[PDB]
Design an enzyme around this catalytic site. Structure first.
Site, mmCIF file in Angstrom:
data_model
loop_
_atom_site.group_PDB
_atom_site.id
_atom_site.type_symbol
_atom_site.label_atom_id
_atom_site.label_comp_id
_atom_site.label_asym_id
_atom_site.label_seq_id
_atom_site.Cartn_x
_atom_site.Cartn_y
_atom_site.Cartn_z
ATOM 1 N N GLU A 119 -7.774 -7.783 -11.940
ATOM 2 C CA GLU A 119 -8.130 -8.050 -10.136
ATOM 3 C C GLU A 119 -9.268 -8.278 -9.697
ATOM 4 O OE1 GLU A 119 -6.710 -4.542 -8.479
ATOM 5 O OE2 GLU A 119 -4.171 -4.770 -8.851
ATOM 6 N N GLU A 135 -10.511 1.645 -6.406
ATOM 7 C CA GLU A 135 -9.231 1.510 -7.602
ATOM 8 C C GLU A 135 -8.276 -0.155 -6.891
ATOM 9 O OE1 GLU A 135 -5.951 3.527 -4.978
ATOM 10 O OE2 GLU A 135 -4.488 2.631 -6.836
ATOM 11 N N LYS A 142 -1.877 10.503 -9.546
ATOM 12 C CA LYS A 142 -3.131 9.419 -9.592
ATOM 13 C C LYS A 142 -4.137 9.900 -8.603
ATOM 14 C CE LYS A 142 -2.440 5.852 -7.071
ATOM 15 N NZ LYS A 142 -1.464 4.775 -6.234
ATOM 16 N N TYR A 143 -3.107 10.190 -7.674
ATOM 17 C CA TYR A 143 -4.321 10.369 -6.590
ATOM 18 C C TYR A 143 -5.612 11.722 -6.698
ATOM 19 C CZ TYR A 143 -3.521 6.466 -3.988
ATOM 20 O OH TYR A 143 -4.049 4.731 -3.906
ATOM 21 N N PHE A 185 1.396 1.554 -3.812
ATOM 22 C CA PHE A 185 0.428 2.566 -4.159
ATOM 23 C C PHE A 185 -0.070 4.039 -3.292
ATOM 24 C CE2 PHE A 185 -2.165 -1.277 -3.859
ATOM 25 C CZ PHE A 185 -1.550 -2.192 -4.485
ATOM 26 N N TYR A 225 0.975 -0.954 0.425
ATOM 27 C CA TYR A 225 0.376 0.236 0.068
ATOM 28 C C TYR A 225 0.881 0.935 0.156
ATOM 29 C CZ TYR A 225 -4.052 -2.913 0.905
ATOM 30 O OH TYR A 225 -4.698 -4.248 0.617
ATOM 31 N N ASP A 264 -16.047 -7.590 2.910
ATOM 32 C CA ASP A 264 -15.982 -7.306 1.457
ATOM 33 C C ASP A 264 -17.244 -6.419 0.746
ATOM 34 O OD1 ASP A 264 -16.825 -8.599 -1.068
ATOM 35 O OD2 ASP A 264 -15.148 -9.735 -0.944
ATOM 36 N N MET A 265 -16.929 -5.419 0.204
ATOM 37 C CA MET A 265 -18.214 -4.556 -0.837
ATOM 38 C C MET A 265 -19.447 -5.828 -1.095
ATOM 39 S SD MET A 265 -16.303 -3.683 -4.190
ATOM 40 C CE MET A 265 -14.655 -2.935 -3.277
ATOM 41 N N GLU A 284 -12.996 -1.710 3.404
ATOM 42 C CA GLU A 284 -11.573 -3.012 2.959
ATOM 43 C C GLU A 284 -11.557 -3.892 3.536
ATOM 44 O OE1 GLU A 284 -8.990 -2.376 1.306
ATOM 45 O OE2 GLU A 284 -9.216 -4.080 1.514
#
Ligand SMILES: CSC[C@H]1O[C@@H](n2cnc3c(N)ncnc32)[C@H](O)[C@@H]1O
Ligand SMILES: NCc1n[nH]c(=O)c2ccccc12
Ligand SMILES: [Cl-]
Ligand code: NA
Lengths: 296, 614
Positions: B422, B413, B311-312, B305, B302, B397-398, B370
C-alpha cells in the site's frame, strides 16, 4: 420374456436352459426359462418353466440337473432350483458379495463349489451347499471377463481380465494364481480330452490354442470373441461366437468348417445337443434361438 | 450436514431405485444412462441396425430430478483408448452418444473413469464434446488414490508384487489426472472424483492432491470396518483423510453393496459433526488488493478494519509502552507527547491512543491526519461529540501536510497483506520531516514474506480473470488478495522486503531486489507465491499474518503472486524466485520471475499490468 438372450445351456436329458436380460427400456431385469422342447424357444407360451429375476442375467450355468447358478447385475450370485415336478424355478440363495456386476460364473468339477468373476476385479470361490464365499481373490487389476473351472480338476480354473492377464488357478498353492504367457482375452474354453490344453479368444477376434507347458492361432471373427464351446465328439469341434453376429465351427487345427450368419445381432452363447452331437444351438440379442446342423 | 450420494451400476427401475436411495438419506444418485452391459455397434452390420429404444426414456423422471438428483456414468465397456482400431471407433461414437444424452437430460454431472495411464483419445473426445457449445455440465473424473495394479493381492506365483518403495511410482494416478486435464486445457468443467481404497498410500501420495479440484470422494463399502456393535466404521487414518475432505466440502459418494448384512451414511454424519470460521465464504475468492492511497475507502471498508479488537489492543499496548519509555514518572503531570495518527480513517487509532494515555498515566496531544474526506466526516463528528479539543483532525495527505509542530510518536496503519504493497514506506518517508529527531514510529519496521504454493484450482481461477480490453495474460501479472484454502505450501515462508521507520539512511531508496531459494521436498507443480507480512509496532509488540507466527487477528488475508505457466518441480529441487519492488515518480509495482528449476518470464515488466498509485 426379455429381448436380450444371454445364455443357453443343454442338460443331460436335453432340456434347454435360457437366460435372458432386459438391456434397455423401462425395467432392466432378467429371467430364467426351461424349454423341454428346444424347438419351442424362445416362445414363452410353450415353455416348461420360467421365473423373473430382479436384475439382468450376465452369465449362468447348470448346477447338476435342477440347479441354475446366475451372475446378476446387482452384484449377487444366485442359485435357482427346479422343484420335484420341474414346473417352478425357485430361488435357492441370493448373496450380494461382489461390489459390481457379476460378469462370469462357472461350476467346479464336484458340482458343489463355484467360482465367480466380477467387474469389481475380484474372483471368489463359493460353497454352494453352505451358501458362503470360501475365498476372495484380487489377482487382476481390471474387470474380470471370464472364469472357467477345470473340467476334471476341482481346484484348477482359468480366468482372464481387462488387465490383459490369463491366469491359471490352483488353490492348492500358497500363491494360487499363475500368469500364462497381445490383445485383451475375452473367452476361455478348456479342452474336453486334454485337460492341460485350453483355447482363448481375444477382443481382436483371434482364437488361440494353448498348452499347459509354456502356440496355434487363427483369425476367426471380425470382432470380439464372446464365447467358445467344444463339441461332445471324441475329437471335439470348436464353436466360436462373436459380436460380429456370426457362428464358426473349427476343427482340431483351428480351421473353419462351418460358418453361420443367421443371427442379426450379437451371438451370446452356443450349446451342443447331448442327444444329437451334430446339432448346435445358438442364441443372441436379436432374440433368436437358432438350431444349426454341423456337418460331421 | 454432509452432501452424499449413492453410486450404482444396477437400476431395475429408476422410480423404485431412486426412491430407496432417497429414503436412506442420499442427496443424489450416480447411475448409467444406458445399460452398462448393453454394448452397441456403430459401424459394422448387422449389429449397428439394432432397433431401439437405445435406453430408458427421459419421461421417467421430471425435469427437476434429472437436473438435481441424477449423475450419469460412462458405460464400462467404452474404451476410447483401446488398442483395436474397431474398438476405438465404436467407443468414440458411444462416448459422444452417452455424453450427448447426459446433456439432453441436463444432468448436473457425468462420471468418467481414469484407470490406466494412456487416456489421450478419451480426453480428445471429451474435449470435442465440451466445445460443442457453452453448456453448464460437470464432468467428474473417477481416479483412484492407488492404482488397482498397485493394490492387487500378491497371490500371483510368477508375478510378485513390488516390495521396494517407488516414490514417484506410487504417485502414478496423479500423473494420470494431470496429463488428462493438461490435454483438456484446464477446463473448468473437469473435476476430480477421488476414489479411496482399503489401504491408504504414503502421505506424499495423498498430499499430491492438495490444490486439485476435488469435487467428490468415493468410498466403497468394503473399506469400512466393523465395531463391537456391528456397525461400519473407518480406520483412524481414513477418518483423518475424511476430515481433510470435509475442509474441501466435497460430496462423498458411497459405492458397492451392503456388506453389513444407510449405516455408512450415518457414520459420515457422525464424523462431520465431530470436529471444532470468520472468513468462511471467502475461501479461494480472488480479490483486488486495496489501495487506500490511490483510492478512497468506503464506509464499510473501515468498518471491517474496526471489527478487530485484538489488532488495536496491540496498537494500544505499543503506545502504552512507548509513552512510559518517553515520559519519566517525575513528568507525568507536565510532559505532553505529540501523537500524530497518519491515516486515522474513522478514528480507531485515535481512541487507541487515548486509552493508552490514561493507562500510562501520561498526557498527549493528538493529531488525526486523514486524506479521505469521507472518513474525515466521521472523525469530525466524533471529535465534536466526544474527543474535543484534545484531538486535532487534519484533512490532508501526510506527504504534503505542513505540521504546526513535530511529533514524539507517529502511529500509522498503512500496511497491506504484502507489507509495503500500500506504499506505507513512501508515505511515512514523506511524513518524516515533522518527526522529532528522537521520535518513535509505530510501526517501527515491517517485513514481507513469500512462499511457493501449488494449487491448480487457484491457477484456473486466475486463468478465468481475462477481460475484453486488456492483455490476454494480464490476469497473471498482478497480485490478488485471497483467503488461500485449497492449496499446497511447497516451502517454509522466507523474508522478502523489509522497511524501517524512521528511515535515517542518507540515500532513501525504496526500490528492492531479492532472490529467494526454497527447498522443495515433494513432487509438485508450482503455480504462484503466497505473500504475508510481519510488523513490529514498538518492541516485543508485533502483528503478523505469517502462518507460523500469526497474531492469535481476523484482518489481512494472504496475497498471491501467480505465474503464467505452471512449473513442474521434482522432490529435492530448489525453487528460486526473483522479486523486485520498482517505482517511478508516479507509481510503484512489483516484478517477479522464477529462475529454477526452470526460468519463467519476468512478470509485470514496467508495471504494464499492475501498478500502485502514488
Ligand atoms: C487504515 S487503511 C489506510 C488509511 O490511511 C489513509 N492514508 C493512506 N495514505 C495516506 C496519506 N498519504 N496521507 C494521509 N492518509 C493516508 C487512508 O485514506 C486510510 O484511511
Ligand atoms: N491498511 C489496510 C488494512 N488495515 N487494517 C486492516 O485491518 C485490514 C484488513 C484487511 C485488508 C486491509 C487492511
Ligand atoms: Cl479480481
Ligand atoms: Na451434484
Amino acid at each position: 420374456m426379455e429381448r436380450q438372450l444371454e445364455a443357453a445351456r443343454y442338460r443331460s436329458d436335453g432340456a434347454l436352459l435360457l437366460g435372458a436380460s432386459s438391456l434397455s427400456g423401462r425395467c432392466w431385469a432378467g429371467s430364467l426359462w426351461l424349454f423341454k422342447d428346444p424347438c419351442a424357444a424362445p416362445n414363452e407360451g410353450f415353455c416348461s418353466a420360467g421365473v423373473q429375476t430382479e436384475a439382468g442375467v450376465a452369465d449362468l450355468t447348470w448346477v447338476g440337473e435342477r440347479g441354475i447358478l446366475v451372475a446378476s447385475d446387482s452384484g449377487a450370485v444366485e442359485l435357482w432350483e427346479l422343484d420335484e415336478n420341474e414346473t417352478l424355478i425357485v430361488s435357492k440363495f441370493c448373496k450380494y458379495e461382489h461390489d459390481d456386476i457379476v460378469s462370469t460364473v462357472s461350476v467346479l468339477s464336484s458340482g458343489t463349489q463355484a467360482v465367480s468373476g466380477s467387474k469389481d476385479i475380484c474372483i471368489k470361490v463359493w460353497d454352494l451347499a453352505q451358501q458362503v464365499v470360501l475365498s476372495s481373490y484380487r489377482a487382476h487389476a481390471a474387470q474380470v471377463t471370464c472364469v472357467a473351472a477345470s473340467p476334471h480338476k476341482d481346484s484348477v480354473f482359468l480366468s482372464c481380465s481387462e488387465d490383459n492377464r490369463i491366469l491359471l488357478w490352483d488353490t492348492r498353492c500358497p500363491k494360487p494364481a499363475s500368469q500364462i504367457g497381445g490383445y485383451l482375452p475375452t473367452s476361455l474354453a478348456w479342452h474336453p480330452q486334454q485337460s492341460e490344453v485350453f483355447v482363448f479368444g481375444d477382443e481382436n477376434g483371434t482364437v488361440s490354442l494353448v498348452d499347459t507347458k509354456s502356440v496355434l492361432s487363427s483369425a476367426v471373427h471380425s470382432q470380439c470373441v464372446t464365447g467358445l464351446v467344444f463339441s461332445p465328439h471324441s475329437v471335439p469341434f470348436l464353436a466360436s461366437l462373436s459380436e460380429d453376429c456370426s457362428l464358426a465351427v473349427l476343427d482340431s487345427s483351428l480351421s473353419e468348417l462351418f460358418r453361420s450368419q443367421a443371427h442379426r445381432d450379437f451371438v451370446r452363447d452356443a450349446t451342443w445337443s447331448p442327444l444329437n452331437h451334430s446339432l448346435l444351438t445358438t442364441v443372441g440379442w436379436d432374440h433368436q434361438v437358432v438350431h444349426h446342423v454341423v456337418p460331421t | 450436514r454432509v452432501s452424499s450420494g449413492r453410486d450404482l451400476n444396477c437400476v431395475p427401475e429408476i422410480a423404485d431405485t431412486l426412491g430407496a436411495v432417497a429414503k436412506q438419506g442420499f442427496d443424489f444418485l450416480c447411475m448409467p444412462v444406458f445399460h452398462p452391459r448393453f454394448k452397441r455397434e456403430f459401424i459394422q452390420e448387422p449389429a449397428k441396425n439394432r432397433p431401439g429404444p437405445q435406453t430408458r426414456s427421459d419421461l421417467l423422471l421430471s425435469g427437476r430430478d434429472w437436473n438435481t438428483l441424477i449423475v450419469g456414468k460412462l458405460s464400462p465397456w467404452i474404451r476410447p483408448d483401446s488398442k483395436v482400431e474397431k474398438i476405438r471407433r465404436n467407443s468414440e461414437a458411444a462416448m459422444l452418444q452417452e455424453l450427448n444424452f447426459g446433456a439432453y437430460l441436463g444432468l448436473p454431472a457425468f462420471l468418467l473413469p481414469l484407470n490406466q495411464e494412456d487416456n489421450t483419445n478419451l480426453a480428445r473426445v471429451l474435449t470435442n464434446h465440451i466445445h460443442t457449445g457453452h453448456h453448464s455440465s460437470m464432468f467428474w473424473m473417477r481416479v483412484p488414490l492407488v492404482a488397482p495394479e498397485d493394490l492387487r493381492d500378491d497371490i500371483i506365483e510368477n508375478a510378485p508384487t513390488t516390495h521396494t518403495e517407488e516414490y514417484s511410482g506410487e504417485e502414478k494416478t496423479w500423473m494420470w489426472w494431470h496429463n488428462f486435464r493438461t490435454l483438456c486445457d484446464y477446463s473448468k468443467r473437469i473435476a476430480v472424483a477421488l476414489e479411496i481404497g482399503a489401504d491408504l498410500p504414503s502421505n506424499h501420495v495423498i498430499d499430491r492432491w492438495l490444490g486439485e479440484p476435488i469435487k467428490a470422494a468415493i468410498l466403497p463399502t468394503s473399506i469400512f470396518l466393523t465395531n463391537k456393535k456391528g456397525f461400519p466404521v473407518l480406520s483412524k487414518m481414513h477418518q483423518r483423510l475424511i476430515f481433510r475432505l470435509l475442509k474441501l466440502e466435497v460430496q462423498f459418494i458411497i459405492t458397492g453393496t451392503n456388506h453389513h448384512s444407510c449405516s455408512y451414511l450415518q457414520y459420515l454424519e457422525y464424523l462431520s459433526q465431530n470436529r471444532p470460521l470468520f472468513a468462511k465464504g471467502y475461501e479461494d475468492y480472488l480479490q483486488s488488493p486495496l489501495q487506500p492511497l490511490m483510492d478512497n475507502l468506503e464506509s464499510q471498508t473501515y468498518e471491517v478494519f474496526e471489527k478487530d479488537p485484538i489488532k488495536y489492543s496491540q496498537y494500544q499496548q505499543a503506545i502504552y509502552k512507548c509513552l512510559l519509555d518517553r515520559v519519566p514518572e517525575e513528568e507525568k503531570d507536565t510532559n505532553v507527547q505529540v501523537l500524530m495518527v497518519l491515516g486515522a480513517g474513522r478514528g480507531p487509532l485515535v481512541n487507541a491512543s487515548l486509552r493508552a494515555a490514561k493507562q500510562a498515566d501520561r498526557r498527549i496531544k493528538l493529531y488525526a491526519v486523514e486524506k479521505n474526506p469521507n472518513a474525515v466526516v466521521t472523525l469530525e463528528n466524533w471529535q465534536f461529540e466526544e474527543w474535543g479539543s484534545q484531538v486535532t483532525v487534519v484533512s490532508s495527505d501526510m506527504r504534503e501536510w505542513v505540521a504546526p509542530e513535530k511529533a514524539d510518536i507517529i502511529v500509522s496503519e498503512l500496511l497491506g497483506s504484502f507489507a509495503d504493497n500500500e506504499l506505507s514506506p513512501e508515505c511515512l518517508d514523506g511524513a518524516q520531516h515533522f518527526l522529532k529527531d528522537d521520535g518513535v514510529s509505530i510501526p517501527g519496521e515491517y517485513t514481507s514474506f513469500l512462499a511457493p504454493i501449488s494449487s491448480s484450482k487457484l491457477y484456473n481461477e486466475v486463468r478465468a480473470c481475462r477481460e475484453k480490453d486488456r492483455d490476454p495474460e494480464a490476469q497473471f501479472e498482478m497480485p490478488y488478495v485471497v483467503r488461500l484454502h485449497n492449496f499446497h505450501q511447497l516451502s517454509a515462508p522466507q523474508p522478502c522486503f523489509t522497511f524501517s521507520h524512521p528511515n535515517r539512511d542518507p540515500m532513501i531508496d525504496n526500490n528492492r531486489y531479492c532472490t529467494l531459494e526454497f527447498p522443495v521436498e515433494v513432487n509438485t507443480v508450482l503455480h504462484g507465491f503466497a505473500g504475508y507480512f510481519e510488523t513490529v509496532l514498538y518492541q516485543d509488540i508485533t502483528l503478523s499474518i505469517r502462518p507460523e507466527t500469526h497474531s492469535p487477528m481476523f484482518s489481512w488475508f494472504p496475497i498471491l503472486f501467480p505465474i503464467k505457466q505452471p512449473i513442474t518441480v521434482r522432490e529435492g529441487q530448489t525453487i528460486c524466485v526473483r522479486f523486485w519492488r520498482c517505482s517511478n515518480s508516479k507509481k510503484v509495482w512489483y516484478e517477479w520471475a522464477v529462475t529454477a528449476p526452470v526460468c519463467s518470464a519476468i512478470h509485470n515488466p514496467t508495471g504494464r499490468s499492475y501498478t500502485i498509485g502514488l
